């Protein structure tokens, strides 16, 4: 929320708030919550996308039969860029609707993030507490509870690392897509991608 309390300050920009254009000074502190929720969501989606894109460029795919006749290698033949278009529309819709359920359940939680909740703290158990619905209580984030061994300071440091790696992953995934769309724009990319 308030641009201050948030933890994202790091050594790369000096130990200060990095707001060159003063976007944070023209908001009423209600929108800074939305910006840290969206920043963390962007960073997390971006690092997932980055590792997935690197996997696709390397050519690693599942053993086969994404669908009935289609194979994983065949549907990822033309690199990772066209892989999404190649994937079956039905499975595409199932990915989209499970993401819809996740991102609707995350929004429906009572404290929210904009209205006085933690911006970034996705609820661990999105589908519980819903009358008339049942799910097998598998918590969305950290299902195996890796974070129990971590103390407060350690998880603060790891949240800092999360923000840094998410920002770097945003830069990386945009580099990948831009390098594909404009050859030679990202010189560290080979013909694989």
């Amino acid at each position: 929320a308030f641009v201050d309390s948030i933890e994202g300050v790091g050594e790369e920009t000096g130990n200060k708030i990095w707001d060159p254009l003063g976007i944070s000074d023209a908001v009423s502190d209600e929108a800074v919550m939305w910006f840290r929720h969206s920043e963390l969501k962007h960073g997390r989606v971006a690092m997932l996308a980055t590792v997935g894109y690197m996997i696709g460029a390397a050519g690693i795919t599942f053993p086969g039969e994404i669908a009935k006749g289609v194979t994983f290698a065949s549907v990822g033949a033309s690199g990772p860029y066209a892989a999404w278009d190649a994937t079956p529309t039905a499975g595409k819709l199932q990915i989209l609707t499970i993401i819809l359920a996740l991102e609707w359940a995350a929004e429906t939680k009572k404290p929210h993030y904009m209205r006085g909740g933690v911006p970034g703290k996705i609820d661990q158990l999105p589908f519980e507490g819903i009358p008339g619905l049942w799910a097998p209580k598998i918590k969305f984030w950290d299902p195996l509870n890796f974070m129990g061994a971590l103390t407060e300071e350690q998880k603060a440091r790891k949240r800092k690392s999360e923000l840094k790696n998410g920002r770097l992953a945003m830069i990386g995934i945009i580099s990948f897509l831009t390098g594909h769309n404009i050859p030679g724009s990202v010189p560290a990319l080979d013909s694989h991608f």
Binding site: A26, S28, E30, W34
Partner: protein
């Protein structure tokens, strides 16, 4: 004491524009004396917002378009009127404008609503009252710029026949020559 406009300092102030954002006194033709300020300002904000969306959309459609719509900016209106996708905008904007005319009727009758205030502020920009006046002035500035921007966009596009910049062919060369 006599009040002079800050934009036309050779004229006396209208005195009807008091207590409004962007009040440099630009009203030489005295529309505020005849029509009410609430109606005039609601019209101003409507034009500002529609012009901002229009000037962004014109430039955007000059570059990218959806797969179904393979028309250029100029023929997009006719093509989409034929297709029926402008009726779908006139029905869902006309619903919005039915609610809007109810609102402007209420505020002209003195409900309490401001000229162009719909309360639409989901993300909370300017929820602090200190920043709201500055953001209102910035809204008006950007919208009044966007009106001329869209006018230039359409007129120069038709006049030149060029896609994004709306510049004659000779203007892309030797325009800084002695």
């Amino acid at each position: 004491p006599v009040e002079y406009s800050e934009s036309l300092p050779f004229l006396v102030k209208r005195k009807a524009l008091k207590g409004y954002v962007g009040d440099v006194g630009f009203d030489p033709l005295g529309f505020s004396e005849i029509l009410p300020m609430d109606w005039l300002r609601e019209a101003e904000l409507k034009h500002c917002r529609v012009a901002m969306l229009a000037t962004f959309g014109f430039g955007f459609t000059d570059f990218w378009h959806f797969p179904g719509f393979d028309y250029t900016t100029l023929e997009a209106h006719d093509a989409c009127v034929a297709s029926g996708a402008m009726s779908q905008l006139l029905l869902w904007i006309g619903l919005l404008e039915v609610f809007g005319t109810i609102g402007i009727d209420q505020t002209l009758r003195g409900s309490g609503r401001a000229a162009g205030d719909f309360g639409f502020d989901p993300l909370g920009f300017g929820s602090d009252p200190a920043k709201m006046a500055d953001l209102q002035m910035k809204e008006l500035a950007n919208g009044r710029l966007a009106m001329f921007a869209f006018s230039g966009f359409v007129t120069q596009s038709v006049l030149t026949g060029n896609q994004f910049p709306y510049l004659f062919d000779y203007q892309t060369t030797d325009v800084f020559a002695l």
